[PDB]
C-alpha cells in the first residue's frame, strides 16, 4: 500500500565500545594529583538511567584502569621535576648509631637512625663542609662506611617542600560525544553481563590512593562483601576483597623530629632529618581487634564458598624487599612501611575465626618503619626523597579492602592459603573503576519510513 523510503534520524540512542582520552575534574598546596588544571565538576551531574538494556563489563580488560595508571605516574613525575636532584649527597657517609636508651613497649627503636657525617660541596664550588644527618636504616647501605641506598644506578629527587601528596578525589570525564556506562547490579562481581545500567558524563571521584596489601579510603560495597577475581581457580591472579564496612586504622609517628636545611648548591637546599627532641620512638599502627575479627569472619565465609570444606589459612607475606612485601601508605609526606604479620596471623575451621585469644587487648599493633628514599612503581619514574615534616605525625584511614593472592594452591592437606600479596598498583585502581566502561555515541542512524521528499 506504500513504498518504504530511507530516512535519517539524528539523536539515535546507540553506542559502541571505544577507548578515548579522558579528562579530569575536581588551597595553595600544589596538590600533585589534583592540580589547579582540573576543571570543576558539575554541581548537578545528572545520571541517566537506561531502559531494558544489557551490557558486558570486564574490570580486568578495562582501559580506564590502564589510562589511570599512566596518569598517576605522569602526575607523580613532572610534579617532582623542578626540584633538587641530590646528586652531591652520593658520597661516603661516615656513620654510627644513636642512643635510643633515653618502657615504651611496642615503640622502641633497635639499632636504626644512624648518625652520618658527610663531606658535601657547599653552594660555593671550591668550599667543602662537613654536615650531619640522621638516616633510617632502610635508606642506607654499608660498603663503617655507608652510601645512600639506590644512589648507584638512579637519581633520587627531593620533593619540593611545599607540595602536598594528600589524595584528593579525581573525577574522570568523557569528552563530549562519549559517555561512561556504569553497572549498578548487585550481582555484577566485576565481570560479564549487567542489566542495571546507567550513564554519566563523569565518574564519581576517586581518591588516587597508593598503598600495598590494604586498600585505603576507597568505596565500600553497597551491602555485602564482594570477592572479585579474573579467575578464582588461578592462584596467580589477585583476589580483591571489597568490604561493606570500613575498619579503622590509626597510625602514629610520635617523635619531635626537627629538620635541618643544608645548602649543596646555588639555591639547592637539602632537607635533612636534623635531630630528635625528646625520647625517640618507632612508628606504629593500631586497628580495632573486634572489627578485624568480624571482618575476617565474614571474609572466610566468602572464601570458604569459593574453596569449600578446606581449611582457611591466612599467612604473612612470602618475604622479600620491605618496599613491596609490607603494608604501605603515606601520611603528609612520611612514607610508612608496616609489618602485617599480626593481621594475617592464623588459620581456622568452618567459618569460625580462631586463635585470637580473648583478653584485655583491644588494639592490634603493627610495627612500622619510615623510609625517606622511595620507589613508587619500582623501575618506573624516578626515586624520590621525602623531606621530614617536623614531628608528631598522626593520621587515620579507612580499610576498605584487601588484596589477596593464593600461595601456590598445591597444599595436599585440604587447606588453602592466602597472603597479603598483589601485583602492580593497577590492582588498586582496578578495584575502584571496576564498574565503568567507556563507549562512543553514534547519534546518526538509518531506518525505513513511509514518507517521501517533495
Amino acid at each position, epitope marked *: 500500500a506504500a513504498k518504504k523510503w530511507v530516512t535519517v534520524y539524528y539523536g539515535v540512542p546507540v553506542w559502541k565500545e571505544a577507548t578515548t582520552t579522558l579528562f579530569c575534574a575536581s588551597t595553595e598546596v600544589h596538590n600533585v594529583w589534583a592540580t589547579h588544571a582540573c576543571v570543576p565538576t558539575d554541581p548537578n551531574p545528572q545520571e541517566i538511567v537506561l531502559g531494558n538494556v544489557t551490557e558486558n563489563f570486564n574490570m580486568w580488560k578495562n582501559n580506564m584502569v590502564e589510562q589511570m595508571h599512566e596518569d598517576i605516574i605522569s602526575l607523580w613525575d613532572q610534579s617532582l621535576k623542578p626540584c633538587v636532584k641530590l646528586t652531591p649527597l652520593c658520597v661516603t657517609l661516615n656513620c654510627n648509631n644513636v642512643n635510643t636508651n633515653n618502657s615504651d613497649w611496642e615503640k622502641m627503636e633497635t639499632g636504626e637512625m644512624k648518625n652520618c657525617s658527610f663531606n658535601v660541596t657547599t653552594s660555593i664550588r671550591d668550599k667543602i663542609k662537613k654536615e650531619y644527618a640522621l638516616f633510617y636504616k632502610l635508606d642506607v647501605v654499608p660498603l663503617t662506611n655507608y652510601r645512600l641506598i639506590n644512589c648507584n644506578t638512579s637519581v633520587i629527587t627531593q620533593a619540593c617542600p611545599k607540595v602536598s601528596f594528600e589524595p584528593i578525589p579525581i573525577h574522570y570525564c568523557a569528552p563530549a560525544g562519549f559517555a561512561i556506562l556504569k553497572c549498578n547490579s548487585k550481582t555484577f562481581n566485576g565481570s560479564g553481563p549487567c*542489566t542495571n545500567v546507567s550513564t554519566v558524563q563523569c565518574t564519581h571521584g576517586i581518591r588516587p590512593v597508593v598503598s600495598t596489601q590494604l586498600l585505603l579510603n576507597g568505596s565500600l560495597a553497597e551491602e555485602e562483601i564482594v570477592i572479585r577475581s579474573e579467575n578464582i581457580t588461578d592462584n596467580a591472579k589477585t583476589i580483591i576483597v571489597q568490604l561493606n564496612e570500613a575498619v579503622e586504622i590509626n597510625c602514629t609517628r610520635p617523635n619531635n623530629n626537627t629538620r635541618k636545611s643544608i645548602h649543596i648548591g646555588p639555591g639547592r637546599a637539602f632537607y635533612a632529618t636534623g635531630d630528635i627532641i625528646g625520647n625517640i620512638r618507632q612508628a606504629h599502627c593500631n586497628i580495632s581487634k573486634a572489627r578485624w575479627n568480624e571482618t575476617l569472619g565474614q571474609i572466610v565465609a566468602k572464601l570458604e564458598e569459593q574453596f569449600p570444606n578446606k581449611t582457611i589459612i591466612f599467612n604473612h607475606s612470602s618475604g622479600g624487599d620491605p618496599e613491596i612485601v609490607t603494608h604501605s601508605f603515606n601520611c603528609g609526606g612520611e612514607f610508612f612501611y608496616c609489618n602485617t604479620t599480626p593481621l594475617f596471623n592464623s588459620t581456622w575451621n568452618n567459618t569460625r575465626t580462631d586463635d585470637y585469644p580473648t583478653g584485655g587487648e583491644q588494639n592490634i599493633t603493627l610495627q612500622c618503619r619510615i623510609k625517606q628514599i622511595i620507589n613508587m612503581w619500582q623501575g618506573v619514574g624516578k626515586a624520590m626523597y621525602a623531606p621530614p615534616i617536623r614531628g608528631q605525625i598522626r593520621c587515620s584511614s579507612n580499610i576498605t579492602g584487601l588484596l589477596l593472592t593464593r600461595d601456590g594452591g598445591r597444599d595436599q592437606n585440604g587447606t588453602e592459603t592466602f597472603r597479603p600479596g598483589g601485583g602492580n598498583m593497577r590492582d588498586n585502581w582496578r578495584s575502584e573503576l571496576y564498574k565503568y566502561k567507556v563507549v562512543k555515541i553514534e547519534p546518526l542512524g538509518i531506518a525505513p519510513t513511509a514518507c517521501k521528499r517533495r
Partner: antibody
Amino acid sequence: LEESGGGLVQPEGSLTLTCKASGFDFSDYHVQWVRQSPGKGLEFIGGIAYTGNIYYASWAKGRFTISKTSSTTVTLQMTTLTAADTATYFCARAYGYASAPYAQYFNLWGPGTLVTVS
Amino acid sequence: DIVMTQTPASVSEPVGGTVTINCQASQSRGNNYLSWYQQKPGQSPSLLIYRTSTLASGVPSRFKGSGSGTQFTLTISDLECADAATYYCLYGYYSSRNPDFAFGGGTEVVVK
C-alpha cells in the same frame, strides 16, 4: 508481582501456580515461595537463585517443584495435596548479590493465591 | 534447620504506648541475616526491617531493630493504631548447600 492459578483441588490432586514479573524482570533477583495457612504464620517452601540454582525447604519434602520457566515467569508445582495444605501461596522477591552468603530479605511481595483442598 | 521462636504472643497495649518483640534463633551466622515483616490482616506481609539494625525505606521511626547472635528484638516506639499488625521475624542465609530459611510464628500486636 502477581501470582495465579489457584482454586479448588481434590484430595491428592495437584496445582501449578505462576508468579509473573510484571515489570520486575527476574534477572538479578531471587524468587521465593512461601505459604500461609489460615490462622498461621509463614512457612518457607523454597526458591530460585538469580544464578539458576534451585533450592527447597524441609517443609516441602519433595512435594513441591520450583522452576523458572521463562524470563519473567516462575512457577510452583505442588502435588499429592491434603486438607492441611489449604493456604494462601505467595511469591516474593529477594535481591541477589555477587557473593557467597546472601541475606535474602524479602521485598516486592505479591498479593497471594488461594489454594484449597476438598 | 533453624528454628525461630517469638514471644510474647497476643500482645495488647494502649494507643500511645510502646511494644517490644523478643525473637530467638540458634546457629546465627550474624546479624545481617535477619529481617522483620509487618502483615496487616487480609494482605501480604510488607518489609519492615531488612538487617537487624536497618529499616526499609518508607518505615517511620519506630520498629527499631537490635540484637546479638541468636538474640533479636524489635521495638515499636510509638503505638499508633495504624501499626496494629502481626509482625514476623525472618532468618535466612542463601547458600549453595544450606539456605537455612525460617520464619517465627509471628507476633500479633494490638493497639487499643
